[model samples]
Target chain A: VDMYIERAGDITWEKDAEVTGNSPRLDVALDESGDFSLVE
Target chain B: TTDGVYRVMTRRLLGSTQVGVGVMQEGVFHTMWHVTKGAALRSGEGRLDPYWGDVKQDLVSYCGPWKLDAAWDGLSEVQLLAVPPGERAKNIQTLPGIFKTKDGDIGAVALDYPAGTSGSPILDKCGRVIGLYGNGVVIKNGSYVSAITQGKRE
Candidate 1:
């Protein structure tokens, strides 16, 4: 078991269905797992 | 042009503490510093001047370890304030506050109001006063006023 002590947080985006007629939306997420899986 | 002469002022000795106050005049920047017995106060006022080059001035007063006796309580009272524009004089008006000398070190504390409200007190990261909060009255109003803080000189 890799005990990773995460120190910082990241923000991520949630997929939503809106009127997608070329609408600009910024999405972000927070990763507390201390891994680069969602950061890159 | 010739009438634009700059004058620096400082308090040499007051009461028994022999506290040192200094002011440096460069082109526009006025840097201040506070020195104690072992330490020295330093700042760059003349470095940033374009017209006036690096003109260094010293606060030649009592060189530290201001000894105080029992009857010298009233001598510790000092207030630092920025003199308002148009009200310049030789003596900076001290506000009505009481400053307490620390037990062993060259440090002081502002007691209360009407005394401490002259200006924002500037202290080093270690909580030692290096300069007082005084306005540029001589530059703005052609006068002088009381300064906010007092420091030991080297």
Candidate 2:
């Protein structure tokens, strides 16, 4: 589903077909001391 | 890119609740988690819809900031691309809409907002995400979004 619109040698309205990424996850840790940490 | 769009969920005592839509930018995920009670669930999960082969992501970190003022008063073209709970990538809906600001508050026009659509990214004509979908107002045609500038930790 790639879409490209060109006018006067300029490309406009470009659409990418597929989304990229390995589908990662996020983690958040809050210690008793009110400290926070995030792990991916 | 489509890869940035994601479905945000939180684990509650009852069950997993769909918080809303979110986007990944510069290795950080942004969404309207505060508007909902589940905002307390800093430990969250993200799952890409069928569009990304249903990949998963974890909530690594987050920051909440107040909205900032923008020079622009209105947006000629705006879009809302969201994947609601139980929906797949193919089922993702692209909502074409417009927006105007009043005293720094952005109001959306002609958008079909459904439940669990909060936190959806609102892209401006330049293909840059300008804000995240906030709650709708009681007034007719008065939906709003929180600007990205405000969402930044800095």
Error of 1 at B108 (Å): 9.1
Task: Write one digit per residue (lDDT tens) for candidate 2, span B102-125.
Answer: 223333433434566666665544
- Candidate 2 segments whose C-alpha is farther than 4 A from its true place: A1-40, B1-3, B12-15, B35-73, B89-102, B105-107, B140-153
Name the 10 consecutive residues with the lowest summed lDDT in model 1 chain A: A1-10
Clashing pairs in 2: A23-B56, A24-B56, A24-B57, A25-B57, A25-B58, A26-B58, A26-B59, A26-B60, B50-B89
In the range A1-40, model 2's lDDT, one tens digit per residue, is 1111111111122354223211112233333432223322
By DockQ, the best candidate is 2
By lDDT, the best candidate is 2
Tell me how far the alpha carbon of residue B74 in candidate 2 is from the true structure, in angstroms, after superposition.
Answer: 2.3
Worst 10 residues of 2 chain B by lDDT: B50-59
lDDT of 2 at B80: 46
For residue B40, model 1's alpha carbon misses the true position, in angstroms, by 20
The Cα local distance difference test for each model comes to 0.23, 0.37
